[PDB]
Amino acid sequence: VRNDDPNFNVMGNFDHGLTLALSKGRILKETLPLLATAGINLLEDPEKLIFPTTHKQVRILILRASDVPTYVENGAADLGVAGKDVLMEHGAQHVYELLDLQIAKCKLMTAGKGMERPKGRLKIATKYVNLTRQYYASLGEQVDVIKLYGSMELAPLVGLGDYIVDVVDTGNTLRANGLEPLEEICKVSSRLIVNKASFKRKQVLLNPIISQLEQAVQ
Amino acid sequence: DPNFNVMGNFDHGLTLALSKGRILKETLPLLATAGINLLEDPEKSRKLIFPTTHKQVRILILRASDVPTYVENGAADLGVAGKDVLMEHGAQHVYELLDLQIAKCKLMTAGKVGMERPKGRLKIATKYVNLTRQYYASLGEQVDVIKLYGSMELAPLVGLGDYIVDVVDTGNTLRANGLEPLEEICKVSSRLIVNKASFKRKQVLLNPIISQLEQAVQS
Amino acid sequence: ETWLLPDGVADVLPEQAQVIEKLRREAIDFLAVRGYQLVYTPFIEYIESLSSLDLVTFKVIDQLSGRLLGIRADMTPQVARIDAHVRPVEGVARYCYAGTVLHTKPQNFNATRAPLQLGAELYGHDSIEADVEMVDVMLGLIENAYTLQGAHLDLGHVGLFRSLVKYAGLSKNEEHELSDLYQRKALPELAEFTQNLNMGSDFYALGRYASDLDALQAHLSADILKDAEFDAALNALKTTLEQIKNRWPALNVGIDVVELRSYHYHTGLMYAVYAPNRAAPLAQGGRYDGIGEHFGRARPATGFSCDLYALFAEIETVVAPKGTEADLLKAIANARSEGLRVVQLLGNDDLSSIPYATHQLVLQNGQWNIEKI
Amino acid sequence: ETWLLPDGVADVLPEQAQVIEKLRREAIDFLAVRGYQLVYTPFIEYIESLSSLDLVTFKVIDQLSGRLLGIRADMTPQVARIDAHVRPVEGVARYCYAGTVLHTKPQNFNATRAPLQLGAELYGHDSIEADVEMVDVMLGLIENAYTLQGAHLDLGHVGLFRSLVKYAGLSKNEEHELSDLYQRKALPELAEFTQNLNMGSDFYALGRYASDLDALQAHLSADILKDAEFDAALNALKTTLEQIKNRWPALNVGIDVVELRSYHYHTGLMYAVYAPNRAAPLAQGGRYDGIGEHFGRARPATGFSCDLYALGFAEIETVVAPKGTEADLLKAIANARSEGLRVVQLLGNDDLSSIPYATHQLVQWNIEKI
Amino acid sequence: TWLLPDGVADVLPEQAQVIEKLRREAIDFLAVRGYQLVYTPFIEYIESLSSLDLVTFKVIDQLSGRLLGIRADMTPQVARIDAHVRPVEGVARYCYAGTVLHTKPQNFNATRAPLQLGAELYGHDSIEADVEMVDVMLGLIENAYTLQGAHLDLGHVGLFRSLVKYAGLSKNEEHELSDLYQRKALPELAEFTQNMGSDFYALGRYASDLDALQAHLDAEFDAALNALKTTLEQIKNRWPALNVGIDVVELRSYHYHTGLMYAVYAPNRAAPLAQGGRYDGIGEHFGRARPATGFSCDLYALGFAEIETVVAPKGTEADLLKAIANARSEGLRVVQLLGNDDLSSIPYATHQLVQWNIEKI
Amino acid sequence: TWLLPDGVADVLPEQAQVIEKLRREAIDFLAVRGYQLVYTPFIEYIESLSSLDLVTFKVIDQLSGRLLGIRADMTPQVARIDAHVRPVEGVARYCYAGTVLHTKPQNFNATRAPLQLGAELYGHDSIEADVEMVDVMLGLIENAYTLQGAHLDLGHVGLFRSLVKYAGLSKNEEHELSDLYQRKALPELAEFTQNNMGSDFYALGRYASDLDALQAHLSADILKDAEFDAALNALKTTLEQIKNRWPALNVGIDVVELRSYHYHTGLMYAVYAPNRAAPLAQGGRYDGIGEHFGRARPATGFSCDLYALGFAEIETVVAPKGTEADLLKAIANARSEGLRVVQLLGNDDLSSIPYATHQLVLQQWNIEKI
Ligand code: NA
Ligand code: NA
Ligand code: NA
Ligand code: NA
């Protein structure tokens, strides 16, 4: 089970093992210590495409966060770590969300400029098109949306939206640009998602690793 | 003045949307030729609207994906975007006035070195869903696509696609992971795009700035 | 979620409705007195009739014929049918319309899939003067409805491009490819496409100096300036630019000789009005001779349209008590006669049954009066 | 045949349009000053919203959601949605509308698949007085638009039938079967169906003596007359008949206690206006409490609608002036247009024959007939 | 102008030969086990196809004015047949193999037009009907393809349903739980379960392990558990080389499933090769309520060699026609040259007829 | 709730067995004659299915926003395959067998969902391709069913087309004539041909069934025309060869059979049977059918409704429950020979399978009739 070779071959077919997809950046940082408790460590600095681990039947992918649910649901990864925001916006129907890893905590919120409430149908700028619609629907409301990928705080300042929906941590980026957080839509944290087929047929390998990650978190 | 007020309504002036990172670096010297400079370092600030040495020009720093959106909607009067991003978004609602000849690369197909073409309909992994379809259509061909946002070289290795469509510069990332560049779809570089309404009604302000950017590039 | 409306679709509630309705009537009337006769076009037609000029048209099967219908996306081709077949007036004809059109997806950065299209059509006059009237009418209507303060008129003319295509002997594929390049003003691609193209430097000039007639005429070859049809199109534009600038000195006017929106059915002058902080024009129109030829006789035609929503105060309501006493009904009738909105309390309802009430009809010293609160 | 319109669909050309437009505005305005606030409803909605109360609705797929849309066939349920959810006014509310609705096939012996539906809705008042207002408004609007000369008002009340169904303990299937028989007034079948039905002679009486309150009360059992709810419905009808007869002494008013059109969502008074040599009424309405409950809050509601083409073509006069921008000429044109005259100028080298429908000329500048 | 819609493709001859052969052998494998082939309608009134949504293509019937659908799934159609059209007084077995259409691809499928093959067993209550069906499904996959490295996932909705009943949960609570289980959203499940909430949580946490489940936890619940345990044993017996697993909160289409759940997964595939279940009373919408269990698969998922063609010269000489007929009799694909065509008119030719003999090249 | 739409039916097991067997044998009969099976798409963009209708069901594609059709006819689809998808440089042969949908029944058919089987021969210009196809069509009908009392109708559109060319008729005249001929409306045809080369046009309709009588009444002008004479020879040669190959088959002529004249370019062929208005099978030469999709290809082919060439009961063997080797062995041997065998389930007795015809019983395990 142990492996110390950094150039251990983990290429091609890996149906016998687990392909673990990690979000790059902050989620990676907070995830790697947890994984260590399950005897899964990298043998190289990523910043220095598929990576082997200290476990011979586990290999790691480092993806953009958006791709993690895609890879997991399609079975290109057996399991992955994604923000609750990303998961729920993508659609969570084709994966299992087994663990709250309780890392990268933030809040999905509405936000705006003492702006007067506008008269007609509100326009929301967001990358979270679906979550925006569900939230407003829960209030008995419906909105126009413009999908943006970044610099969400700009949208109200140049008239692309009346309000935004975005993740808020410190909320300093907002205060900086004359915006304020308004309503909390939900609490967000990183989650361990598993491909359904993988979960059903790879219990022997998954069950102990999942249990160890659980212990590590609590 | 670095804190010159450029907030709120700016219909009297130009709102310039720049892609962050490399495009910003190569764009700023060109803009300097038109008397447009930042008065602080973006990378060490959190704010996203910047004044300039020109009172009727303010700058937004956007993710590249948002530049066409902002420009076509008129939230920016003009912007700098890669030909790849522009054409994938759809270029019908802006004017592409200048090739700035920066951030040059190629949009290409790519796959595992020497792999035989599979039978049946190909699956392409790409962030360029529309450009992929147009390219294959030009060959009299039709494909399945899976939209991904990054690390495109991974897709063939984990069976998400038979081939990829992606921008290729050095092409070393490909060679590294056992892929090779195949066909060149088009040459890619950063472009100056202009909102149509802005172009029509702000000639007085645009025309000299555009001309100066043009001159700057020719050298 | 049973109350949910589809995306791009909204109620027009009373506050907004009052403003739009008033705007609708005054626009129709402004057109009426200038000779433009109101028509109502059908909401549904056979798809071929609505598509003579799309993905944008909603499509449904006609149970009576088995043929495919469309919901109107644009009334321009409908009025063309009326002028071409239904009312074949032997002479000049003027019509207008104001009604909802439906789009399968929002067009022109619009919020709504259901814009309120108002427009006008002038059939049966060949010369540029018909276009001058229409431009003048469009501007007049916008001024009447809204304001031309800080507005911008963009004038074009497709005859320039079309003439140069003819003189250079370009194929249809080449012509179509150019029109795409111009409409995107993709000047780098235009450079490459025109290099080894016959008369290519004039084609490039047309795109590079699209906004400036002087700079354009300086960079154009004497060959093309000498061409009768090119020169006629240029004169037509120059004369229009002068007359409109005269009639509307407070209006900003610009030129764009490679504005080629819907080039395939436009045949002359192009005209649109833009406003501050709006990507989409307030109104756009053009010369489109023979637009109705699909339906019968080929007719010279020019016209424009706008979304009326692009051009919401509270409502005052007077509450009177229940009753049918003559002096009370009289006072109610006089009030209603002056255009006031008056209701009577029902049954045992008190004034709190009408919480949006702004005024009361109350008997003071033996006479019925309207007072606030 | 490229000019062909679909069956039941026509242009409204200028002569007719002028009349209908004028009629449309005056009707909206007549309602406005009586407190009925104009709204425009959506032309398309999710099918479930338009179907809360069928074959008549045109259906299309929404590309954005994948859900089925309908084109509005009737604005009544739409305004109900507005009152129930969009504008939840805490009190009485009045709205009106005037717009095209589409039917997959002509309804109500109509020529058109595209009638111009005008209507009014009164929400938030329980008592019969709301219905009296609405009947009064409907009549007033018809009188304003057209004429009530030789018109006939048919008043009904579904509470009579509904009350008797309740008291007799009939099942839903029995109730539904009866409502069909009554709506066809199929009295031979009704005789058979009410034989060996509990309280069947009252059910038969309701159909046989539908037009005559006196003759009905004589043939009804004391059991049903004593029933609180039946008697309340009867009183509600009798009081309405009296008040309306007072307000409109020249109007013929009749009764039909088994008028049960759309029984399933009507809950009280029924009212329609008929005219000579027309099968279809000029206008029809009713009490329909809780019509908007599908969408949110349950609201008392009563209202009517009509086809505006049924209440509705003279020639148009046009003045022709010569081409020019001389101040005195433009001045005369402007004054004429100010008075509501339709004035055009000749274009280019066109003479007066370019405007063959010209009735007048501008020729000091004066208007004379041609 | 040659463009096909997304998710729609020709099946050209090389692939068609393989799929056609596969189609026939599957039908025949079912036939000899008593499953009678039917063709279901391609179009029906929408209510008939929707008795169990967005996936169905919808068109108006000009004859009635009612909305039709194109079949997305034949399961409810055969239910109609068994419930109304052929009300057989006893056990009935049917199968089908045909295109179904989806407005958008389902189950990570490439095609909007999968070739759905399936089987239905009506009229037997006991668990043994499910055992047959599982056995038939496995047998058909083995016949068509291979069970090498395959995994059978067995479930049973009666466990969850029984616990819902015993705990007295409302329909809204039951519906909310079923969503949480189907996503196995255990963090949300913890919060939502905090009456008998610890058993509801246990059902999700220990879904894969009967022993661990029974340690962390009623006639009906026990009957469901026995039904699963008995099935697990019999199937493990009949198929010793097959991996079998458990998931007691597999609740796909919970609303119409009433017992055992069964699906077969394969290496490097998100979508199962085949899935089925017990769905008693599936046809009650159409008439009589009937015990029913069945499965289906996409035949393209169980599925391209070249085709050999013999070219003979033009002619109607008896000895030549005779040789052609004998060749065709042996199942060879033979064509004759037309007019003055030479052999280059058939560039895909593999063999020649030239006594008349067949030779390569 | 059980109601199927008009023209739509289940194919239940008794009929299904017959049709399935018929389907396979037809495909296989074609296969060994070089016709390669393809499956065409059930849905396509409407323009692709309409390159040659009211008959096509139409739906919106949510992915593109474009209009789709459900296939009504596979002929244009295989044309697309040959023209674009598989541009084989030479002769190509394909076949198909699948449901097509029609918005209303065609050709006096009971079903809106016929099972279309057909074959296509691309890439050979000369008449011999048509002779093969006619021969294949007849062979397939003979194999599937019987040609006893059948009738082959041969035509050729080149005759009419050639005469249209020589006479210099306009497109409107040509179109009007083709309607008159297809209705054989001889009184109208007389009037229409009165006013260029009209007597030959009339002769073509009057003597359509008789080559001798036709050649006698035709002008020497048109007989001398190269293209007309080539078409006539093409028909005469086909009539002779087919009469030779199939001496027991009735063969007729109709030179003004012009079904779908617009895309047919040569020989026409159909097979009729006793007491049937619709032919069992019909085909023709249609060069360039696929030009819409790419390369212009010579093409000829036919199709039929397989239900028209088509219900005995099914035999089922019932064995007891069990997994004893000798029992399973006997079951397996039976199934190996193509018998339908089931085992009793649980405590079920033989009455659980009421349609049982045979039993497996221990006498060694034997099959005996019930
Ligand atoms: Na127009
Ligand atoms: Na109403
Ligand atoms: Na099934
Ligand atoms: Na055919």
Side-chain angles (χ1 to χ4, degrees), chain C residues 1-15 17-18 20-21 24-26 28-29 32-46 49 55 58-64 67 69 71 78 81-82 85-87 89-95 100 102-106 113 116 122 124-125 127 129-130 133 247 294-296 309 315 317 322 324 336 339-349 352-356, chain D residues 1-15 17-18 20-22 24-26 28-29 32-46 49 55 58-64 67 69 71-72 78 81-82 85-87 89-95 100 102 104-106 113 116 122 124-125 127 129-130 133 247 294-296 309 316 318 323 325 337 340-350 353-357:
Chain C
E1 62 131 71
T2 65
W3 53 262
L4 196 67
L5 292 178
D7 285 3
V9 174
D11 303 305
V12 185
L13 301 171
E15 290 74 14
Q18 168 167 231
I20 298 293
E21 178 66 21
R24 188 213 205 102
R25 295 180 185 192
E26 289 182 8
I28 297 311
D29 292 355
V33 301
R34 290 172 176 66
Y36 293 94
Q37 300 188 1
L38 176 69
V39 304
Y40 302 162
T41 68
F43 256 96
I44 48 164
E45 284 203 44
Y46 292 129
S49 175
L55 294 185
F58 278 105
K59 293 171 182 66
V60 293
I61 217 73
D62 184 16
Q63 289 172 52
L64 298 184
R67 291 178 60 182
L69 300 171
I71 297 149
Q78 299 184 282
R81 174 178 52 62
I82 288 169
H85 177 73
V86 183
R87 293 295 184 76
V89 163
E90 312 274 32
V92 169
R94 295 181 172 74
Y95 305 111
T100 300
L102 286 195
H103 305 147
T104 49
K105 289 175 176 171
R113 288 197 281 182
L116 176 47
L122 196 182
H125 187 84
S127 88
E129 283 200 40
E133 184 186 312
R247 288 162 189 239
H294 179 69
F295 298 107
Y309 297 122
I315 301 170
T317 309
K322 176 191 164 176
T324 55
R336 291 187 170 140
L340 293 190
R341 310 173 178 249
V342 191
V343 294
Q344 283 183 279
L345 295 187
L346 289 164
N348 297 349
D349 293 355
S352 80
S353 66
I354 314 293
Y356 46 90
Chain D
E1 66 284 81
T2 63
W3 53 262
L4 196 65
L5 293 178
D7 283 7
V9 172
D11 305 306
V12 185
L13 301 171
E15 291 74 13
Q18 169 172 231
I20 298 292
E21 178 66 19
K22 188 177 184 298
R24 193 191 71 100
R25 295 181 184 184
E26 288 180 3
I28 297 312
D29 292 356
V33 300
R34 290 171 176 65
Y36 293 84
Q37 299 183 2
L38 177 68
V39 305
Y40 304 160
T41 67
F43 204 72
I44 48 163
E45 284 205 43
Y46 291 129
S49 310
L55 291 187
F58 279 104
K59 292 170 179 68
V60 292
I61 287 283
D62 183 17
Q63 288 170 50
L64 299 186
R67 291 178 60 182
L69 300 171
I71 295 78
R72 67 185 186 197
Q78 299 184 282
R81 174 179 52 59
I82 287 170
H85 177 74
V86 183
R87 290 296 182 74
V89 164
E90 301 288 349
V92 168
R94 294 180 173 75
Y95 305 111
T100 300
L102 288 192
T104 49
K105 287 166 177 180
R113 288 196 280 181
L116 176 49
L122 196 181
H125 187 84
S127 88
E129 283 213 28
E133 184 186 312
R247 287 163 147 119
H294 179 70
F295 298 108
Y309 296 122
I316 298 166
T318 309
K323 176 194 168 182
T325 54
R337 291 187 169 139
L341 293 192
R342 308 173 178 249
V343 191
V344 296
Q345 282 184 278
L346 296 185
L347 287 165
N349 297 348
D350 293 356
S353 80
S354 67
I355 315 292
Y357 46 90

Side-chain angles (χ1 to χ4, degrees), chain F residues 17-71:
Chain F
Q17 166 172 230
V18 166
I19 298 294
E20 178 66 20
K21 190 175 184 297
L22 208 64
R23 190 212 207 101
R24 295 180 186 193
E25 288 181 6
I27 297 311
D28 293 355
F29 175 101
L30 290 171
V32 301
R33 290 171 176 65
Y35 294 84
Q36 300 183 0
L37 177 67
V38 304
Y39 301 170
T40 68
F42 256 97
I43 48 163
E44 283 203 44
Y45 291 130
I46 191 57
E47 292 80 8
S48 176
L49 297 180
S50 306
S51 43
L52 287 5
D53 205 349
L54 294 185
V55 306
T56 293
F57 280 104
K58 292 170 180 67
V59 293
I60 217 73
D61 183 17
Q62 287 171 51
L63 298 184
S64 63
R66 291 179 60 181
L67 202 68
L68 300 171
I70 298 151
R71 67 185 188 200

Side-chain angles (χ1 to χ4, degrees), chain F residues 255-362 365-367:
Chain F
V255 301
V256 298
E257 181 53 56
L258 300 180
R259 171 183 55 81
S260 293
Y261 172 64
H262 57 281
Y263 68 79
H264 283 110
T265 62
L267 193 82
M268 300 287 306
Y269 40 99
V271 179
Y272 299 81
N275 306 117
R276 299 181 208 230
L280 294 189
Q282 50 187 48
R285 170 67 66 160
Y286 36 57
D287 289 341
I289 185 165
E291 187 172 10
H292 179 70
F293 298 108
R295 23 106 94 164
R297 285 274 280 171
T300 192
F302 86 92
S303 62
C304 57
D305 185 3
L306 212 48
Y307 297 122
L309 306 183
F311 311 148
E313 296 283 299
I314 298 170
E315 290 184 343
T316 309
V317 184
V318 180
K321 176 188 181 167
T323 54
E324 299 75 357
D326 71 322
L327 167 67
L328 292 180
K329 183 67 187 138
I331 291 172
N333 293 317
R335 291 187 170 138
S336 175
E337 293 172 4
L339 289 63
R340 311 174 180 250
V341 191
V342 293
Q343 283 182 278
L344 294 187
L345 288 165
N347 297 349
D348 292 355
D349 60 44
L350 178 60
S351 81
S352 66
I353 314 293
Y355 46 90
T357 57
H358 297 71
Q359 279 185 249
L360 195 76
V361 286
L362 190 78
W365 288 98
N366 295 343
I367 299 166

Side-chain angles (χ1 to χ4, degrees), chain F residues 87-100:
Chain F
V88 163
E89 297 292 345
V91 170
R93 294 180 173 78
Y94 306 109
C95 69
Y96 44 83
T99 301
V100 294

